[PDB]
Ligand binder design. Structure first.
Ligand SMILES: CCc1c(C(=O)Nc2cc(S(=O)(=O)N(CC)CC)c(C)cc2O)[nH]c(C)c1C(C)=O
Length: 127
């Protein structure tokens, strides 16, 4: 099969707000992970056609990646911070589901998740 379209990132029928937690998720959390030496495989959707991974989208039906999360934040897609945290968690579990343990991609995902969890523990106070 061809790749699926990427996840939706801007929905004009969704309400929009700025919150301290959402701003922190973009400016501190996403920004910090994005610049990590292991971020690159997670900066865009998996191109399963070009990577010749024909079963990727047979196994992974809720794909997610940081490029998508960044666009969601930039376009006010999320109302609650948990929606964003959930997308990060989906990205990491997809990696753990599809890949064999001990693969480099898994070790990279683990390092990113550790950094993510550290940053998530310092979320600012809710309004
Ligand atoms: C291992 C596949 C994968 C990636 C990934 O992105 N791998 C990848 C990307 C590129 S590439 O992005 O540079 N590239 C050239 C533009 C794509 C064709 C190259 C050159 C080699 C790679 O192994 N990410 C995730 C989450 C996964 C899995 C299955 O969990």
């Amino acid at each position: 099969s061809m790749n699926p379209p990427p996840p939706e990132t801007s929905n004009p029928n969704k309400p929009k707000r700025q919150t301290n937690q959402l701003q922190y998720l973009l400016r501190v959390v996403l920004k910090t992970l994005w610049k990590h030496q292991f971020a690159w495989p997670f900066q865009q959707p998996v191109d399963a056609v070009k990577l010749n991974l024909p079963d990727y989208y047979k196994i992974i039906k809720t794909p997610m990646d940081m490029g998508t999360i960044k666009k969601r934040l930039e376009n006010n897609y999320y109302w609650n911070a948990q929606e964003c945290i959930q997308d990060f968690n989906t990205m990491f579990t997809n990696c753990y589901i599809y890949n064999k343990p001990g693969d480099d991609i898994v070790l990279m995902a683990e390092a990113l998740e550790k950094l993510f969890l550290q940053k998530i523990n310092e979320l600012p106070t809710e309004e």
